[PDB]
Amino acid sequence: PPPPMQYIKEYTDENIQEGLAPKPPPPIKDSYMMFGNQFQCDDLIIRPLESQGIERLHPMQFDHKKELRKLNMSILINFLDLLDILIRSPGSIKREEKLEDLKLLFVHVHHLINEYRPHQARETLRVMMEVQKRQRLETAERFQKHLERVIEMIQNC
Amino acid sequence: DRLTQLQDAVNSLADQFCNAIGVLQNPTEEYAQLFAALIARTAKDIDVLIDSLPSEESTAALQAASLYKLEEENHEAATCLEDVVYRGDMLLEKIQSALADIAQS
Amino acid sequence: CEKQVQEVGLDGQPLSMSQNLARLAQRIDFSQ
Amino acid sequence: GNRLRFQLELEFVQCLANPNYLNFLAQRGYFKDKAFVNYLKYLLYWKEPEYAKYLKYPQCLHMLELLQYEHFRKELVNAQCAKFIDEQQILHW
C-alpha cells in the first residue's frame, strides 16, 4: 500500500517551496492512532484502582506494597474458594473467578514492571556515570605517572 | 530487576491455582497437599517480591529527581574528565613537539 | 548522561592500526 | 496534511521496514525518482522520541537509512537478503 501520494508534486527538486515542499509531518498531535498513551485499570477492570507512590527520599510506607499484598491475598483466597466450589459442585463454576484472578495478577505484574523499570534505569545510568568518572580519573592518573616516568628517563641522561 | 521475576511469580501462582482447581476433583490428599505448598510458596514469594521491589518512580517525581541528580553528577564528572583530558593532551603535544625537535637535529 | 548505548558496546577498543592504515591508503592514494 | 497524511506516511514507513515489501516497492520504481529520497529525508526528521515512538517497528529508521544506497537497495531486492533479515528478526523476536 503506497501511501505516499502526490510525491512528485510536493517533493520536487526543480524549485522547492518555502519550507514545506516535501515536509512529511508526523502525527505528533490531532491523531489518536496510538491511542493517547495506553490502557489503564479503570476501563477494562471496572473496580477500585488500588495505586500509590511516594516521592524522593521517602519510602511508600506500606501504601503500594501493602495494597498489592492485600490484593494478592484476596485473589488467592477467592481462587481457593472457587477451587473448593468447583471440586464440590460441578466443574463450570470457578471459571469466572479464575479469569478475574488471572486478570488481577496480570495487572499487578504490569504495574510492578512499570514501577521497577524507571528506578532500575536511573540506577543503571548513575552507575554508568560513576564508572565513566572513575575510568577517566584512573586514565588521568596513569597519564600523569607516565609523564613523570618520562621526565625521569629524560633527566636521567 | 525483580519486575519480570514478580511477573513470572504471579503467572506461576495463577497457573498453580488453576491446576489445583482442575485436579481437586492417599493420591488425592497428597496432590492437594502438594498444590497447597506450591500455591502458598508462590503467593509468599510474590508478596515478598512486591514488598522488597524498587519503591520509587511508580509516580513521576522521585524518578525525575533522581535522574536530575544523576545528570548533575554526570555533568560535574564530565567537566572534571574534560579538564584532565585537556591536561593529558597538552602533555602529549609537548612530548610530540620535543620528539619532533629531537628528530629534526 | 544516558550513554548506556555506548557504555554497553561490548562487541555490539584502543587506536586500531587497521583504521589508520585504511585512512593512510585513502590519503596517500593521490596528492590531490 | 495533517493527521491522515501523517498516519499514511507512518504506515508506509512501517511497511517498507519489512523485507517483503522491499521487492514490491522496488518494482514500482518510486525509489528511482528524487521524490522518494526527499520523502525519506523529510521523514528522517521524526527521529526524536515524539514520533518514532508511534512507529511499532523500531528497525524502520535503520532500514530506511540503509535503503538510501543503490547497492543496498539492489541487495534487499533479492530474496536471499530478505530471507536472512526475516530469519534474524524471527530469532530476535
C-alpha cell at B8: 513470572
Distance CA D39, CA A4 (A): 8
Q: By the 8 A CB rule, do B10 and A69 touch?
A: no
Half-sphere exposure of A86 (CA within 13 A, CB side): 22
Q: By the 8 A CB rule, do B16 and B38 touch?
A: yes
Q: What is the resolution of this structure in A?
A: 4.0
- Angle CA(B60)–CA(A64)–CA(B2) in degrees, nearest 5? 80
- Angle CA(A122)–CA(A128)–CA(A130) in degrees, nearest 5? 105
Residue with cell 522488597: B52
Give SS3 for D1: coil
Distance CA B36, CA A114 (A): 30
Task: Report chain A residues whose CB lies below 8 A from the CB of D46.
Answer: 24, 26
CB neighbours of residue D59 within 10 Å: 14
Distance CA A112, CA A68 (A): 9
**How many Å from the N-terminal Cα to the C-terminal Cα in chain D?**
34
C-alpha cell at A150: 618520562
Half-sphere exposure of D78 (CA within 13 A, CB side): 8
Q: Which residue of B has its CA nearest to C2?
A: B71
Distance CA B61, CA A55 (A): 6
Distance CA A55, CA A68 (A): 18
Buried b (16+ CB within 10 A) or exposed e, A93-114: bbeebbebbbebbebbbbbbee
Instruction: Report the 3 state secondary structure along A8-41.
Output: HHHCCCCCCCCCCCCCCCCCCCCCCCCCCCCCCC
Distance CA A140, CA C15 (A): 17
Distance CA C2, CA C16 (A): 26
Distance CA D9, CA D32 (A): 18
Experimental method: cryo-EM
CB neighbours of residue D26 within 10 Å: 17
Q: Which residues contact A62 (CB under 8 A, 6 or more apart)?
A: none
Helix, strand, coil shares of chain B, percent, nearest 5, are: 85, 0, 15
Distance CA D37, CA D51 (A): 19
Residue with cell 536511573: A122
C-alpha cell at B90: 597538552
Distance CA D43, CA D14 (A): 12
DSSP state of D46: G
Q: Which residues contact D24 (CB under 8 A, 6 or more apart)?
A: none
Task: Report chain B residues whose CB lies below 8 A from the CB of A116.
Answer: 1-3, 53-54
Contact A4 D30 (CB under 8 A): yes
Output the CA–CA distances (angstroms, integers) from residue A127 to A119, A124, B57, B72, C25, in the order listed: 12, 5, 17, 14, 41
Distance CA B25, CA A94 (A): 13
Q: By the 8 A CB rule, do B11 and A105 touch?
A: yes
Output the CA–CA distances (angstroms, integers) from residue A21 to B85, D29, D31, in the order listed: 46, 21, 18
Distance CA A11, CA A6 (A): 8
Whether C and A touch (3+ CB pairs < 8 Å), yes or no = yes
Q: What burial class does residue B23 get, using C-beta atoms within 10 Å of its C-beta: 0-12 exposed, 13-18 middle, 19+ buried?
A: middle
Which residues numbered 1-32 in C keep a CB inside 8 Å of some CB on B? Answer: 1
Q: Which residue of C has its CA nearest to A132?
A: C7
Secondary structure (DSSP) of D12-44: HHHHHTSSHHHHHHHHHTGGGSHHHHHHHHHHG
Helix, strand, coil shares of chain D, percent, nearest 5, are: 75, 0, 25
Q: After which residues does chain D show a gap where C to N exceeds 2.5 Å?
A: none
Distance CA D11, CA D45 (A): 16
Which residues numbered 32-71 in B keep a CB inside 8 Å of some CB on A? Answer: 39, 43, 46-47, 49-51, 53-59, 61-63, 65-67, 70
Radius of gyration of chain D (CA): 13
Contact A124 C4 (CB under 8 A): yes
Identity of the residue numbered A103? K
Q: By the 8 A CB rule, do B4 and A113 touch?
A: yes
Output the CA–CA distances (angstroms, integers) from residue A123 to B56, B67, D40, D83, in the order listed: 11, 9, 37, 40
Radius of gyration of chain B (CA): 30
Instruction: Report the 3 state secondary structure along C1-32.
Output: CCCHHHHCCCCCCCCCHHHHHHHHHHHCCCCC
